[PDB]
């Protein structure tokens, strides 16, 4: 489940996935998710943002990109 | 940037290259361990959850990576060889650790940051204004630097770290700023044996002034200033020490101190100091104190603990409400019934009422005791503790007590299952004590009356291990140490239960206990030493040695404990029990070959008191007051020792138990024994000849001295008997000194020479006063001269410095306005009485009849005694009167020298010495008369009981001129006072400590040096009494109302026809050996005090046993039955 978008995820409702995710670009909100398995953030996130609202990561988060602002 | 909003993340790995990722955690977010292998900034913003916790900079971290933290972290670990820098920009880190691998590590702590623990394992540079609470500098951290000093530094390389600028930790630091004010800092307080309070304080801005206010334990405010009182102050640099006067009341003092400099008046500082000398007397709740007849003399102690209040439903109740106690199945149903009705409220009222006799007396409630349940639960929680404490204060307040003591026996171990206990007892006891102290202080802000808080504590190491001594001690005025039951029949071999010192390695003692307590931080000041008024017993002890440290078999029958009074009555040197002393432990014990008894006596009490003074302890506590001897000897010993004047050692004191050996003929002295109990000091169980000196035994009569059989502490002088060289016509005074070497106590001095008597063969005298205002020739009741040895004829009088018949004293003749009485007085039948006395002198040719000159209101002595010339004239005239009317001697009844009976007769200060010169001259003249007339003439006086009398006459200088003193051991109390008491009692009642008796009066004469054989004990054939006397204890020692209808002085004859069996019941004070009458109906209640046949028997017995010359009574006319006289006479013959 390897994202490159916008604000991708559910609304007022929690929603379960699994497997190794790879949010690979700036500005990508992810919301009311619950991720069994890993979260990757890659050098492709660059100098830009990535928000995570009421998320869960049962596996490993790995921040390899993002800037300071 | 990456935002982690109300999210959950686990482990996080950061290998961001080149410039940092910012990672933020918002709201309820939650992050696992962050592992840093690149550039990063953790931030926690608007965080309600926990966010980040553990962070580690790993060896994969690249050179010059930027790593910064903001937030609240747990463990942060710098473990990265690439010259790591950690920036901490805000927040907190519990433990930051710089690993041995992190070469040239730099840690930058921004100004608001707090690292609680920083651990250094490599030389580290710590920068910035951020704070480190403890830097742990291990060897690898040697030479680390801090721009701002850590709060504390630990670890082996502590002393190698550098701090502060180039100035050195904390910097140039200067100034300021405008200091000036006088501040007072308290250093400490101390007491000494003399009961001085010493206050030491550092006074900054010493301007040669300060003001101290002391509050006594009884509430007296008192002020001291450098101005009025620099005599009591001593200044050094900041050091100033205030020193009170000697002899302050024992217990807790409150003080305030402050300095000034003209106007600029310092902060007032306050505290508590403790004055040595407390005596805590435990008093049992299960005695009915209102009915008790053994008495309580609260002058001998400072504190009275009511033992005990109990715990029911987590509150404090009287012991009658404690079912564990009242329903003990081991006693009888009738025993339980007494327990259920235990008179606690009556008791408590009687005991606080003893304040009248000692106004400084504090009374506390002691809560708990052996087998008292409820403490573990009471202390369990903040609300259980609240009910309890409030309850305790209610008890204290309900009975008007002065404080609270707890005796929990014991926290944690519960005395091994006797009571309920738990591990938490230990902190819980601390909290409970804290609370009580809080509440008592709270209440005192309202009442302005200070309240004590104290405990009783176990002597064992188990006990000290179960409580928080250093923690509880600040809440306590003192700890009462239970330095008794140290050993007991539970031990397989005998030892001492309450010894002062440990004589062998496994014997516990007061000293072992006090050393244990001092070794745990408890101050000496706050330690009361315990003593016991009971023994511990072992049965079936092997019959070896002295019984001490010997094996014991079965304790099945054993009483366990025997109270001291019972030991005195039936064991100590009685019934085959030998008294022994352990001179290393300083403790006595008994052994009979099978039973061993360890106990506390007069000697162990003195060693214990001396230990207390020597170690500057708080005082002496004992369990329990009611177990003492009849005389309260243990209580009295304790008081004497702790209140002894520094610089004067105590003298050995004696009394007499057997003071007469009587000649069988003019020259044959039978064998006999004098016995003298010690009143102060304790004989060695076995004395030696050199420990006692006896003088006055006739030449060629041998004697030995030994300890008296069947007495605990008395000398026996065994007179062998034999043939005295010449006839013995008068008594021989025998004097016994008990030397310092006789006693167990260390630094006493010799007793005064005690007087006892060898009586000549006719025995004691029996002297009757015969009133001259009775016409004896015509009186149907006659004088029986076979029952008297002596008569005093009352009276001749003094007119114009000449001795005259009583009809020539116009003051007396006209005393009453009755013209009948005046005529009868003018015609007083003296000549007829003198012919009558002469006929007496035929049917008892050995009778002596003396003329008494003087009596009540009789004038002329002070004038007669004034110069050699007036003495001469009075003496010559008294002698002419003596011969003219056929008298065999002269008695002088001067009532009274110096004080004149408070203005009834003329008096002067000079009467004191002139009385001595008067008697001396009278004895000289009567020697002359005797040597002219072929016979011996007596000279005697009548003398009074009051200390003012004793002080107004030179008793030790006058006895030599006198055949005897007829001491008026009567009129002690009467209508001039409002409270009832015995007017003539032979002993002082147990219920009126310090009161008058024959015993007390005749002892005081002896302590002035008068020989026993020059004393005559006085009986009164009349009564005194009071009206409006409450019907409580049949009127005895009761406050009485208006005395306008007082019965005055009825004679025994009046008693017979008007009082006996007329609504009066006869009672008996057995301790006083005195009768009294009560009639609830007569005049608001009427109480009568008199002598009867029984009391006169005992006066007579007293005379015989004390070696007195005899007995006298006033007067023959007052008992026409002959029974009062017959009682004396039969006992003196017996
Ligand atoms: Na946190």
Author numbering:
A (entry chain A): 214 to 282
B (entry chain B): 283 to 1416
Give the original sentences from the paper that presented this experimental model.
This enzyme has three surface-layer homology (SLH) domains (~18 kDa); it is specifically expressed on the surface of the bacterial cell and degrades chitin. Based on comparative sequence analyses, ChiW has two glycoside hydrolase family 18 (GH-18) chitinase catalytic domains (~42 kDa each) and one carbohydrate-binding module family 54 (CBM-54) (~25 kDa), as classified in the Carbohydrate-Active enZYmes (CAZy) database. In this study, we have determined the crystal structure of the bacterial cell-surface enzyme ChiW and demonstrated that this elaborate monomeric enzyme is composed of six distinct structural domains.
Thus, two truncated mutant proteins have been prepared to determine three-dimensional structures, i.e., ChiW-SLHd (Val198 to Lys1418), lacking the signal peptide and SLH domains, and ChiW-CD (Val557 to Lys1418), which is composed of the two catalytic domains. The interpretable electron density map of the ChiW-SLHd structure was obtained by the MR method using the ChiW-CD structure and the Buccaneer software, and refined at 2.1 Å resolution. The CBM-54 was predominantly a right-handed parallel β-helix (Ala214 to Phe449). The GS-rich loop (Gly450 to Asn463) connecting CBM-54 and Ig-1 domains consisted of consecutive glycine and serine residues with a length of 35 Å. The loop is located in the catalytic cleft of Cat-1 of the symmetrically related neighbor molecule in the crystal. In the crystal structure, the location of this cleavage site is on the SB2 face and in front of the 11th β-strand at the fourth coil from the N-terminus.
